[PDB]
Amino acid sequence: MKNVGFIGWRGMVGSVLMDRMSQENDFENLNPVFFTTSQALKSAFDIEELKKLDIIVTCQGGDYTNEVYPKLKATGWDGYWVDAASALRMKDDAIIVLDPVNQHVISEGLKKGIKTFVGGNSTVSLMLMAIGGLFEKDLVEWISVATYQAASGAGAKNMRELLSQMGLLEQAVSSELKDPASSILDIERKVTAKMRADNFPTDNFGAALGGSLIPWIDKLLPETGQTKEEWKGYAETNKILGLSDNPIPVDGLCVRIGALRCHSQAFTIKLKKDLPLEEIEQIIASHNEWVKVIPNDKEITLRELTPAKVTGTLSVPVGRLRKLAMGPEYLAAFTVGDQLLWGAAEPVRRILKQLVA
Amino acid sequence: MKNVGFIGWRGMVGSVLMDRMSQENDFENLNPVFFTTSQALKSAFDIEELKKLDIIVTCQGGDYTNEVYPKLKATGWDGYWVDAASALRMKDDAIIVLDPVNQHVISEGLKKGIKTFVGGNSTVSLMLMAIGGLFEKDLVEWISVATYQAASGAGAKNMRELLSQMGLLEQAVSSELKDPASSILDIERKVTAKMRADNFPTDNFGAALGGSLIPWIDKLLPETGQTKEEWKGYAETNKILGLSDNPIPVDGLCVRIGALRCHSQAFTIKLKKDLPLEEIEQIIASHNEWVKVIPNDKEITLRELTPAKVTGTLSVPVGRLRKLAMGPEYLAAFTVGDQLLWGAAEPVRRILKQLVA
Numbered sequence: 034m035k036n037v038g039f040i041g042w043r044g045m046v047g048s049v050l051m052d053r054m055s056q057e058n059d060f061e062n063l064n065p066v067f068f069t070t071s072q073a074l075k076s077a078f079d080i081e082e083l084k085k086l087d088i089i090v091t092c093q094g095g096d097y098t099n100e101v102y103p104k105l106k107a108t109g110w111d112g113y114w115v116d117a118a119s120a121l122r123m124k125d126d127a128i129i130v131l132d133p134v135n136q137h138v139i140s141e142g143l144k145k146g147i148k149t150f151v152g153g154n155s156t157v158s159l160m161l162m163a164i165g166g167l168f169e170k171d172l173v174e175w176i177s178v179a180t181y182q183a184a185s186g187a188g189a190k191n192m193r194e195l196l197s198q199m200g201l202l203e204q205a206v207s208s209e210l211k212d213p214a215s216s217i218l219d220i221e222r223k224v225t226a227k228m229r230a231d232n233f234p235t236d237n238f239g240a241a242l243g244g245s246l247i248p249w250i251d252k253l254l255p256e257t258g259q260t261k262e263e264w265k266g267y268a269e270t271n272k273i274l275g276l277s278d279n280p281i282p283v284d285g286l287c288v289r290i291g292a293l294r295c296h297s298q299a300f301t302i303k304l305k306k307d308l309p310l311e312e313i314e315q316i317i318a319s320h321n322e323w324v325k326v327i328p329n330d331k332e333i334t335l336r337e338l339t340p341a342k343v344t345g346t347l348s349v350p351v352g353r354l355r356k357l358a359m360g361p362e363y364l365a366a367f368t369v370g371d372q373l374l375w376g377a378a379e380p381v382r383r384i385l386k387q388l389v390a
Numbered sequence: 391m392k393n394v395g396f397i398g399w400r401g402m403v404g405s406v407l408m409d410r411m412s413q414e415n416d417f418e419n420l421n422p423v424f425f426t427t428s429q430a431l432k433s434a435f436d437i438e439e440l441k442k443l444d445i446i447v448t449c450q451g452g453d454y455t456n457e458v459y460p461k462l463k464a465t466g467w468d469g470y471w472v473d474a475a476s477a478l479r480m481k482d483d484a485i486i487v488l489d490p491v492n493q494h495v496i497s498e499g500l501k502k503g504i505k506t507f508v509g510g511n512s513t514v515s516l517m518l519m520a521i522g523g524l525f526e527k528d529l530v531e532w533i534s535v536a537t538y539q540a541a542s543g544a545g546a547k548n549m550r551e552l553l554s555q556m557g558l559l560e561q562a563v564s565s566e567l568k569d570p571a572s573s574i575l576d577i578e579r580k581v582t583a584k585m586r587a588d589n590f591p592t593d594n595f596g597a598a599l600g601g602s603l604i605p606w607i608d609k610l611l612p613e614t615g616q617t618k619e620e621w622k623g624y625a626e627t628n629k630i631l632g633l634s635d636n637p638i639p640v641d642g643l644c645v646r647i648g649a650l651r652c653h654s655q656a657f658t659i660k661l662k663k664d665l666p667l668e669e670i671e672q673i674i675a676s677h678n679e680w681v682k683v684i685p686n687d688k689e690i691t692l693r694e695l696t697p698a699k700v701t702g703t704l705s706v707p708v709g710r711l712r713k714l715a716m717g718p719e720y721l722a723a724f725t726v727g728d729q730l731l732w733g734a735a736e737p738v739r740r741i742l743k744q745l746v747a
């Protein structure tokens with residue numbers, strides 16, 4: 034069978050990948066070799082050991098990639114490189130994977146001789162898994178986005194920091210909350226005071242997240258004023274769909290909220306033509322087996338369209354669908370998706386599966 | 391001096407109003423009469439007692455208003471009715487107040503003989519206080535909105551429920567969080583399990599808010615598919631600006647997040663003409679003394695553009711300003727504002743001040 038090396042399999046994303054591969058019995062169809070960066074398992078920095086592998090799957094990160102990758106291909110190695118990190122997404126000899134959406138793009142690359150495949154930006158991937166249909170019919174002129182991103186996208190320590198912040202806030206008024214007759218503004222003043230305290234743990238986010246939000250993710254790109262996270266919307270959406278010749282505008286604001294691992298997004302989709310809502314809904318629900326169209330009903334929306342419902346599942350609900358006041362060609366849409374699955378580990382697991390078949 | 395009656399002054403909004411009036415020494419210029427609904431202070435249901443007042447300020451709510459209001463005006467009473475509730479906002483003989491934005495609209499009404507003035511929708515009011523300038527120059531063709539609304543808009547019990555939810559989530563993994571070597575996915579599984587537990591207190595929101603979000607606020611309006619909260623965007627923005635003849639489209643998705651009392655909003659503003667960012671920024675910052683333009687810089691954004699910074703203050707920061715990929719006439723903007731102040735108590739306090747001068 035194909036000899037597959039795994040790097041960064043112990044990290045958070047790597048861990049999800051390992052769990053998903055086990056659940057699906059993916060290890061039965063390949064010969065796994067595990068690497069580590071520890072000096073305390075082959076060495077992740079042993080080029081000769083990596084050179085003997087047919088495929089390398091890394092969830093180690095960009096710094097690792099930028100270091101080892103060049104060296105490895107510099108030895109002639111002609112194997113496949115599957116990466117979760119963003120390091121190589123924008124390279125000419127690499128393809129961004131999300132097979133339920135761009136399978137045809139993936140297949141052509143395997144023929145052109147493409148040997149590098151990279152998982153895509155979580156936000157963009159979750160968007161495409163939700164409204165892939167609209168793009169599948171060149172029905173989208175542009176999309177304005179507003180995200181509600183989870184701590185998992187930032188990292189494990191960030192998730193822990195969010196949780197600690199939540200605890201401290203409640204702890205600040207634990208007794209008052211138990212007293213059904215206590216003043217709410219008093220409670221409010223105290224939690225806000227704690228949130229602003231110097232001892233409030235905000236080292237990882239650089240600001241409070243629990244009980245608040247942060248309208249800024251990643252570095253500023255002076256060229257356009259977007260953060261790198263927002264920049265990936267236009268850049269990655271079009272490379273994934275392979276439309277670098279007829280790019281579809283995708284822009285908006287990426288905001289961090291206090292959710293653990295599900296990214297949510299509010300959309301304003303300008304459609305190229307006036308179409309019936311019922312038809313839009315059918316097109317969306319038919320693109321893939323994971324997207325799930327939620328009726329624009331309160332009770333059902335509260336049960337299905339939330340991080341609480343989606344966390345840890347492969348389901349990608351999309352709802353609140355209706356026409357906007359700007360015109361019958363303006364579509365409103367809200368979606369929730371797990372950041373660690375379709376937003377990270379899953380696309381990686383699925384391309385590997387293809388490569389070892 | 392003018393005889394002013396106050397109803398619902400003990401509730402959350404009423405409490406903020408009382409505090410703000412005291413801080414500003416507003417009681418020195420009027421003769422206050424306090425009412426109550428308790429049978430255990432005049433009776434809030436004594437029409438003859440209310441009839442002798444020059445002005446009535448109520449934060450009691452819609453049910454109260456719809457009950458007492460008709461009866462009072464049915465006796466000939468020719469005084470002013472200042473209300474925080476939405477009950478009468480859309481009546482022909484009433485004006486929605488937000489003086490820093492529609493003072494000229496307010497003045498004309500006082501002449502036409504308008505005797506009813508109502509505070510506006512929190513989200514709409516906070517939007518206008520932020521980007522009032524753009525509207526002040528008929529520079530806005532339409533605006534797509536995505537909100538991050540606080541629990542305070544729902545009520546005191548909702549704020550308490552959010553806080554309780556946060557505590558339980560952290561409590562579910564308190565020890566693991568203290569252990570710097572513990573597994574994050576283990577932590578994740580436990581908090582999510584608690585969030586989904588039947589004993590997780592979600593009676594007030596009908597769903598978990600802490601650690602999640604709810605893409606639905608208020609009742610569904612079958613006619614358009616919008617929730618009443620989203621509906622107020624178009625309805626109230628234009629009545630406040632008095633443009634029911636040349637309405638400006640305002641639509642989007644209103645989502646509840648785990649914040650105590652600050653509403654935040656991500657905007658996609660389609661401008662009528664191509665203008666320089668620097669000029670847009672100047673126009674915005676000049677509309678009123680409370681709006682505050684935050685440089686599109688990471689460090690400053692994290693310190694100024696958040697519920698943590700704004701909570702309990704009259705400041706209305708607006709930042710992340712830049713042009714969108716859809717074109718140089720597409721503006722991106724993010725704002726944060728306290729829901730109980732400019733979103734409720736302040737506009738009420740300011741119109742009262744005018745009426746008693």
Ligand SMILES: N[C@@H](CCO)C(=O)O
Binds near residue numbers: 187
């Ligand atoms: N989607 C994640 C990126 C994952 O690394 C985030 O919002 O940070």
Ligand SMILES: N[C@@H](CCO)C(=O)O
Binds near residue numbers: 511512
């Ligand atoms: N702006 C508040 C409405 C206040 O009653 C909310 O978002 O619920």
